[PDB]
Amino acid sequence: NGLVALGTVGSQELFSVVAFHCPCSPARNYLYGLAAIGVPALVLFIIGIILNNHTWNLVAECQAPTFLLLSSILGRAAVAPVTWSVISLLRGEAYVCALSEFVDPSSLTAREEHFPSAHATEILARFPCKENPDNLSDFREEVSRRLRYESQLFGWLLIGVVAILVFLTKCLKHYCSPLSYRQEAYWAQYRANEDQLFQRTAEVHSRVLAANNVRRFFGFVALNKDDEELIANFPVEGTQPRPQWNAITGVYLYRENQGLPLYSRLHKWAQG
Amino acid sequence: NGLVALGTVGSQELFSVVAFHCPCSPARNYLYGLAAIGVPALVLFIIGIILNNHTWNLVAECQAPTFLLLSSILGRAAVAPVTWSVISLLRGEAYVCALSEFVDPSSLTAREEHFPSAHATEILARFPCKENPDNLSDFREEVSRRLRYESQLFGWLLIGVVAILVFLTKCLKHYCSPLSYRQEAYWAQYRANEDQLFQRTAEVHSRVLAANNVRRFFGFVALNKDDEELIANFPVEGTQPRPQWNAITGVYLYRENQGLPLYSRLHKWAQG
Amino acid sequence: NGLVALGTVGSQELFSVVAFHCPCSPARNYLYGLAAIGVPALVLFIIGIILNNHTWNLVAECQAPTFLLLSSILGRAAVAPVTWSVISLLRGEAYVCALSEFVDPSSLTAREEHFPSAHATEILARFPCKENPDNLSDFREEVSRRLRYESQLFGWLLIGVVAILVFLTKCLKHYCSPLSYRQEAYWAQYRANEDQLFQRTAEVHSRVLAANNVRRFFGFVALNKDDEELIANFPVEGTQPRPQWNAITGVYLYRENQGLPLYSRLHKWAQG
Amino acid sequence: NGLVALGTVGSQELFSVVAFHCPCSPARNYLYGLAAIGVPALVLFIIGIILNNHTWNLVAECQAPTFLLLSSILGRAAVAPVTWSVISLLRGEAYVCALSEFVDPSSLTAREEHFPSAHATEILARFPCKENPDNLSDFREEVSRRLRYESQLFGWLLIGVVAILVFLTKCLKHYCSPLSYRQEAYWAQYRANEDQLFQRTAEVHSRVLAANNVRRFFGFVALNKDDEELIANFPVEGTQPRPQWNAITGVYLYRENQGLPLYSRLHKWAQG
Amino acid sequence: NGLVALGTVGSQELFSVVAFHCPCSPARNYLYGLAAIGVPALVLFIIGIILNNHTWNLVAECQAPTFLLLSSILGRAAVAPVTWSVISLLRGEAYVCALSEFVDPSSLTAREEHFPSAHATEILARFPCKENPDNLSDFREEVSRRLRYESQLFGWLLIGVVAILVFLTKCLKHYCSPLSYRQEAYWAQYRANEDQLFQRTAEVHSRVLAANNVRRFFGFVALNKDDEELIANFPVEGTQPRPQWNAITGVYLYRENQGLPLYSRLHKWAQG
Amino acid sequence: NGLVALGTVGSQELFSVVAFHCPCSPARNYLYGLAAIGVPALVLFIIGIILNNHTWNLVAECQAPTFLLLSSILGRAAVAPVTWSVISLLRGEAYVCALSEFVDPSSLTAREEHFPSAHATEILARFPCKENPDNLSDFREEVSRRLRYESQLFGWLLIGVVAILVFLTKCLKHYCSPLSYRQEAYWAQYRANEDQLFQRTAEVHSRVLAANNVRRFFGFVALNKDDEELIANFPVEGTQPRPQWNAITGVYLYRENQGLPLYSRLHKWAQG
Amino acid sequence: NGLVALGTVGSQELFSVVAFHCPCSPARNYLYGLAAIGVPALVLFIIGIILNNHTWNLVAECQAPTFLLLSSILGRAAVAPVTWSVISLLRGEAYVCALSEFVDPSSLTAREEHFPSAHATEILARFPCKENPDNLSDFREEVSRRLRYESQLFGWLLIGVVAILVFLTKCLKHYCSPLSYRQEAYWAQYRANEDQLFQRTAEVHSRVLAANNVRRFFGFVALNKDDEELIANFPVEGTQPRPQWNAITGVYLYRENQGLPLYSRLHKWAQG
């Protein structure tokens, strides 16, 4: 949760220091807007998919359920790109730089000289740049406001729709699940604790095996006090074979034994 | 990981203090741009290849797998030059200094006097310099913006493609590998621990051998308390012969013994 | 490594406080540039050769291998002069002060009055000085930029070539060496430890011999607590003869005993 | 070594506060320059010769080797005057104040009125002073630069030659010496330790003898705790006769006993 | 040594606060200069002779050797007046105030009106004062510089001659002395230690005698803890007669007993 | 010694805050100068004579030697008034305010109108005041300088003569004295210690007698812890009679007993 | 002594804050001056007489010697008023405000219009006030200076006479006294100690008697720890009768018993 706030502060500082620079020219406008606003979205989406464990379980499985699996992964990923997109929409100055060229020159009330010529769409496109002829500046301000309107409106609608989707995926997960409400919280706690304990234990065991391997070369290994106590307590011979390592990996759907429940593939293997 | 951030801050400060100085002249423009933007790329690439262990294993081996080996080394190296290149593209003011000369004088809308003469490409090339005749300055601003556009666009496209390549090499490594997903993490932990323990132990053993050699000369060696305890605990005679040292070095593909796995050449040698 | 950074900071401060003062006159220009930019290079090269142990081993030996010996010494020396030279080239304002006089007066586009006279090469040479006649200043700026171009270009090319040479000498040392890759790192650790232990022990032994010599004069020597414990622990009679001291000094190529390796001449002497 | 840096900082502050004041007059120029720049050189040279032990050994001896003895003393002395001289040359404003008068009035290109008259060498000599007639100031600047050129050039050449001489005396000492390379370092350590121990012991012994002499007068001496422990530990009768004191002083060339080496005259006397 | 530095700082602050005020008038100039620059010299010389022990030994003796005795005393005294004199010469503004009147009015090149009249030597003498008529000021500056020249030149020559005399008296003391080089350093250490111990012991003994005298009056003396321990340890009866006190005082030339040396008159008396 | 420095700082601050205010009028000038500069001299002289012990010994004696006694007292007194007098002379602005009136109006070179009239001595006397008529101011400055000259000259001559007298009284005391040189220093130490011990003991004894007297009134005295220990240790009956007190006071010339010396009248009385 | 310095600082601050305000009017001038300068003198004199013990002894006695008694008291009192008076005289601006009216209008040299009229003594008296008519101001300054002259002169003469009187009363006390010089110092120490001990003991005894009186009322007294220990140690019955208290008070001339001296009336009573 806090990592999300750190990423949000980082995205704010990145928007501040990335210096969005709107080119004013007929065709390149919306192209540059689209790219500059949606490429970091793709980058953050890819990072989200990368730093998630579930996707690697899914790909290892390849060698109704898929719905909820993909839902979990795509949500935990798309948390951040939507944040960046709405922060960029609310600020404006990206939507207007894109859709400035399409502002209809005819239909907008102002002082005289409604719009000069057909060739003038270009000086229309320049509107996001300073581009302030006396005959234009006030007429121009109108377009800036009328575009920032649509930008911020889409931003607020997007925030609303994201909230509605979060609430609906919540209210739909529970109503369609075999487990009760509290058993799932217990399951999540168990999963986190198992992950942490397994990582730490695998590290200690690996270090002990490496110490044995080294000592078999020189005649003595060199350790700190911590590692000394470690190799004093835990002996080690050699890790389990590859089939065992394979039985652990994968995705796990909640399976019950005769009466008792099984909360993970490691659990399923510890019993049999 | 943190070293990458330190190198990034160093690259930022180096760009700030290196003082890119765009010469304005017809031919030298893109030459100077290419060199000043792509020579430090070569330097950082070379440093990356130098400070990597895997490449020296590869060259010691010379005395499908090569694909993944070269992939690992070239990625761990080219992390930094791509960073420098994109930081230089996003800033602009390098792409425009290069491709200013090629801006077509005919096709760009502005005030009267579209473009003076054929000899004027030179005063065109001067555009990145101050070079602001009253007949030109406003017409010039157009070229600056239109070039910074293409620069930042290529920068964003490059960031996107780099992200896509990272994600694809990830998703392709796992899907084509004999091991499971978690066994590889255990393998990486074991490799790091073995490297650290081997380095420290080799240092202690060398110091002990040197102390023996010295003491055989004067009649007594001089030590601190630390070294005193060291020579008190660990005796030493003489390091293993050269064939043994040779059996350790090299690149290692995952080989299994009868059932049990072998996680490194040192491990492979400790058993037999 | 850190000493190199300290020397770099010192070179920067020395360039800041040495006050390069470009004389503007026809012949003296490139002479002063050459001297002021390449004499401290010679000084730093000489210091590098002086503060290196290997060269004194080489000269004591005088009373294919020489290739690598000279390579090691010349590299560990020429680390610094190349740094100073490239820092001076990138700044410019030394190359232009040298090669200002040779700027061809004919071929450089500008306003009217291309170049006044044959006697005017002198007012050409003055270009690095203020020397700003209204008929000249703008025409002059061109030469300053066109020269700083070549200066910084040579600087970047030099950095690139130095990086390439570092990488090639690395990749050529390993591929042509009897030892493995890791045995050489162990060798370097042993060499450093032997040097440190030998220096400290020789100092303690010398101090003890001096204390004996003194005490034989007055009737009692005067010591601190440290020296008291020293003379309490380590007795001393008299240092080994001169042939023994001679067997230690020199350059050492990796020689193997029957099976076991010998890592230094001191080691070679401790066995026999 | 650090004392050299302290002396350098002191020389810098002394140059800052000594206020070199160039008189502008025909004959007195180079006289004042020579004196003010080379008298403190003589002072520092004399101080260097005074604070060196070796010279007093040499003079006590008077009551091929002399080459190296004089070399050691003259180098350890002339370390500082060369530093002062080069710091004064690089700054300029001393060489120009000396050789201003000799600047040939004919051969130096400038505006009209090349040089007024024969009597004008005087207003030439005034050039280091403000002395700025409108007909002269610009013509004058030329002479200032052309002289500072030669000054800084001689300074850099002097630094280079000093470095070359240091390197050559180094490379010539070792190649022509009976000892090995490392035995000389051991010798230097022994010499320093012997000097320190002898000084401290002579002081303690003198204080004890003085305490005995005093106590024989009043009936009791008065001491601190330190001196109390001193007179408690070390008894004293009376220092050795004058011939013994004489056998210690002098210069010592490396003499070998039957096999074993002798590292100082005190050592030579402790054996026999 | 440090006391010399404190006296130097005091002399600097005294020169700063004493406010040398040059009167401009024909005859009084050099008189005031001579007095104000050479009377504090006499004062410092007298203080030096006063605070030296050797001179009182010399005068008590009155009730080749005298050469070295007077040399020691006159040097240890004249250390400071020469310092003050050279600090006053280098600053100038004292020599010029003295010898302004003697500046020959005829021989000094300048603008027209070489020198007005015979009565004008007076307005010449005024030169150190502001005294700036338009017809004079520039002509005057010449005299100020030409006089400060001679002042600083004499100052530097004096520093040089003082250094030469120091070096020659050093090199002449040793070459003509019965003792060796190191025995004299031992002698100096013994002299300092004897002086300190004798002073402290005489003080303690005097205080004890005074305590006895007092206690014989009231019936009890009053003491601190320190004095309590003092009178507890050291008894006292009455100081030695006057002939003994006389045998101690005087000047001592190095006299040898049969074999052993005698380092002071107190030593000479302790034996017999 | 330090008290002299404190008195000097106090005299400086007193001169700063006493606000010497020179009245300009014919007769009152030198009167006010004499008084204001020589009355605090008398005050400091009187204080010096008051705070000296020796003078009271001299006056108690009244109920060649007298030469040295008066010398000691008059010197220890006149230390300070001479300091004040020379500090006042060096500053000037007191001598000129006194002897302004006597400046001969005829003999002083300046501009025209040498001196107006006989009645003008008054406007002459006003010279130390602002009193600056255009016809006078410059002519006046001359008199100020010419008088400050004589003032500072007398000040320096006085300092010199005081130094000479100090040195001569020193060199004459020793040469004419029965004692040796060191015995007198021992004598001075004994005198100081006797004075201190006698004062402290007399105070303690008086307090004890007072406590006895009080306790005989109420029935119990009230004490601190310090006084408690005092009355616990030292009993007291009643001070010695008046003849004994008389035998102690007076001036003492060095008298010898049969062999042994007697260093004070208290000592002389303790023996008999 | 320190109380005198505190009173002096207080007098300075009181003079600063009392705001002497000179009225300018013919008759009231010297009246106001006299009062404002001599009434605080009377106040300080009265305070001095009040806070002195000796005067109350003198008045209790009423129910050649009187000379010295009155001398002691009047001196210890008039210490402060003389200080205030001289501090007021040296500042001036009080004497001039008093004796302005008496300045003879005829005899004072200045510009024309010597003094206007007989009625003008009034505008004369106004001189200490601003009162600066153009015809007067400069003529006025003369009177201010001429009066401040006499003021400061009387101040310095008063300081001198006070010093002379102090010295003469000192030199006359000793020469005419039965006691020796040191016995009087012992007497003063005894007097101070007796006063302090008697005061403290009387306080403790009074508090104990009061505690007994109280406890006889309620049945128990309430005390601190200090008072608890007090009433634990010292019992009390009732103070001595009134004749005894009377025998203690009074003035005491030095009376001798048969041989032994008696230093106070309390002492005289403790014996009999």
UniProtKB/Swiss-Prot annotation, chains A, B, C, D, E, F, G:
- Where, by tissue, is this protein expressed? Placenta.
Extracellular face: residue ranges? 20-28, 100-146
Where do the segments described as Intersubunit interaction lie?
Answer: 181-218
Asked whether the keyword Coiled coil is assigned, the reply is no
Q: How does it sit in the membrane?
A: Multi-pass membrane protein
**One cellular component term from this protein's GO annotations in UniProt:** plasma membrane
Please list the residue ranges that the record places on the Cytoplasmic side of the membrane.
53-68, 174-272
Stretch list, region Hemichannel docking: 112-119
Cross-referenced Pfam families = Ca_hom_mod (PF14798)
**GO biological process per UniProt:** ATP export; calcium ion import; positive regulation of apoptotic process; regulation of microglial cell activation; regulation of synaptic plasticity
Gene Ontology molecular-function annotations: monoatomic cation channel activity
Q: Which domain of life is it from?
A: Eukaryota
Record keywords: Zinc included? no
Annotated membrane-spanning segments are 1-19, 29-52, 69-99, 147-173
Q: How is its activity regulated?
A: Inhibited by Ca(2+) and ruthenium red in a voltage-dependent way.
Q: Which family does it belong to?
A: Belongs to the CALHM family.
The record describes its quaternary structure and partners as: Homo-undecamer. Two undecameric hemichannels can assemble in a head-to-head manner to form a gap junction.
The record's annotation in PANTHER family points to:
CALCIUM HOMEOSTASIS MODULATOR PROTEIN (PTHR32261), CALCIUM HOMEOSTASIS MODULATOR PROTEIN 2 (PTHR32261:SF3)
Record's protein name: Calcium homeostasis modulator protein 2
| Organism of this sequence | Homo sapiens (Human)
